[PDB]
Amino acid sequence: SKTYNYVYSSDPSSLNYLAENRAATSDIVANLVDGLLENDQYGNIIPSLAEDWTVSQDGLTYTYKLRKDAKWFTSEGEEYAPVTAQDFVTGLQYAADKKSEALYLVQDSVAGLDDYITGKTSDFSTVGVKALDDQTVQYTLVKPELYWNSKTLATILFPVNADFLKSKGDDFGKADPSSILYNGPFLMKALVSKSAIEYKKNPNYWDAKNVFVDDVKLTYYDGSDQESLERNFTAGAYTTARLFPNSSSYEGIKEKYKNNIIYSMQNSTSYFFNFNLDRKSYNYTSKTSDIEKKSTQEAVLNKNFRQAINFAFDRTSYGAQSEGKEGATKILRNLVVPPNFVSIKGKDFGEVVASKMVNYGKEWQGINFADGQDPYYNPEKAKAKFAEAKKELEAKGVQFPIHLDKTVEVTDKVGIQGVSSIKQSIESVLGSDNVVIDIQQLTSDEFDSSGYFAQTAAQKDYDLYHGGWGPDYQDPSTYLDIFNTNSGGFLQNLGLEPGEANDKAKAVGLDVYTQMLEEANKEQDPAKRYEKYADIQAWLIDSSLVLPSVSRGGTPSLRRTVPFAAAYGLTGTKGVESYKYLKVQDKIVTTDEYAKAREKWLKEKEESNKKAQEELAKHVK
């Protein structure tokens, strides 16, 4: 038997792929449930449960033909029932009925779905998903979406068996392998909080031939023993290992593995810092007075203040805490939309955003948004912006310094160094008589419930947050919509609730931002549409409501995985998240072997993408 062994860091709150928008859930379910389409090794969208599909000439009707040999299985591997088109009707009705946190992916796209979710109608037969027969599912959209098929790689568009769902009721989708049915490459054999996630290859999966490992075992990793990754790799227990050049052990590791260290490419997941614009919870704070809390509440609404923090935040120093001195810039990401995410007549998105910055003030003159460098850090600009913020805030009675709470997990030693670097950088540039970053070290449970797994904006217990977005579909709106005041998926992390559009959101212009998103979304020509989203991304950078930080990837590893065997996707949950396609080998890959494979993959990706674009036209009516 061939096994992949490594670690995981995030336990899921549930397995409810229809109701969750957290990667903690979809990273797991990517291995357990398939949707209509998936990815190949090159990022092409290829058949999954749907063996064929058509789109109408007006772009509003998508029809999918499901393969007859796809079945649902229990967690023990027993066949439950064939997959049918009705399962996609069931899945969408359930996502709507449960008010899924990912409803923004479909609520404004599928005909009638907004009316049903919001109570304008009560009958799901008016919603644009239909099972025409057992093998044929048909979606009806409100407007054309060239990116619609990419959306089927998001879990809210995955199927569910209605009888199983009914039998389970509120038990459906709990963090228990028996809470869902399986139609994907693996069965979940173990899901143990703070201990293990274990997958077993499903021998009767419709595409079992493309699953090259029989078992996947992930041991819980809390960040307290970073040397354990290479230690267990070298002992033969892990298949891969992420290296930490700051560790005392790195000198010896690099001498042993001089020809084996492999750096991954930066990918489309973007991280950024944001502020809590309407903080309600103060369990984790170093502030002791209402004047301090009100002073911070006022400061985070002040644009000059946010820009001063932006220009005082040394991203190189931050990156160096995990990547070491020489690799410090390899992870840096300077927009929310990756600069190469789309192109506009051959110009990259980030270049167009840079072009738009000329209208947002001298403080952005000459900015370059390329990955892998820090265009923000600028102490003299930061100090000048802060002086302006301080005059504005003092006129309101604000007391200085402004204390900003940032949380970190007590066991997460690299994360503690990261946040310590941001404290040092900001306080060094602006002065601790002006800003203090108060680091709150929390237990796992406290870190989870005040942050990523908080269920309301009111439970967010911090002034600064560091989270990120993985794109759900191939359009800049997947990133830029997450701050809109009507339905933004990231709004709670800013302390705001979708719908409200309250005084604080208006104070920082997020209502204007939301209106801009609405206008840009109406544009159907891709070049024009992308140009409008570039202006929207420029507005957001200028607003400094986000402080772009890092991406995933760009990091060193040792590997016994076969280079570029796995699936890859720019968006969705069927790429690197999936252990389908992945292969393991005995030999530790060399840097030179990886480089040769990378150049081969880069060349083949362009050829394959061109073929894929050709194949697309055969599907119109």
Residue numbers in the entry: 32 to 652
Question: Could you pull the original sentences from the published paper?
Answer:
The crystal structure of AliB (residues 28–652) was solved at 1.65 Å resolution, revealing a closed conformation despite the absence of pre-incubation with any peptide. During the modeling and refinement process, additional electron density at the AliB substrate-binding site became evident, likely originating from Escherichia coli peptides bound during the purification process. Thus, we modeled E. coli peptides (VMVKGPGPGREST and PIVGGHEGAGV) previously reported to bind AliB. Although the electron density map clearly outlined the backbone of a nonapeptide, the side-chain density exhibited ambiguity in places, suggesting the binding of a heterogeneous population of peptides. Given that the observed peptide lengths did not align with the reported E. coli peptides, an identification effort was undertaken through mass spectrometry (see below). (A) Cartoon representation of AliB structure (colored green) in complex with an unknown oligopeptide(s) from E. coli modeled as poly-Ala (depicted as yellow capped sticks). The three-dimensional structures of AmiA and AliB revealed the capture of oligopeptides during their expression and purification from E. coli. Surprisingly, our analysis identified a total of 356 distinct peptides bound to the AmiA protein and 393 peptides bound to AliB. AmiA predominantly recognized peptides consisting of 10–11 residues, while AliB favored 11–12 residues.
Given the auxotrophic nature of pneumococci for certain amino acids, the Ami ABC transporter system, orchestrating oligopeptide uptake, becomes indispensable in host compartments lacking amino acids. The system comprises five exposed Oligopeptide Binding Proteins (OBPs) and four proteins building the ABC transporter channel. Crucially, SBPs determine the specificity of their respective transport systems, thereby governing the range of molecules capable of entering the cell.
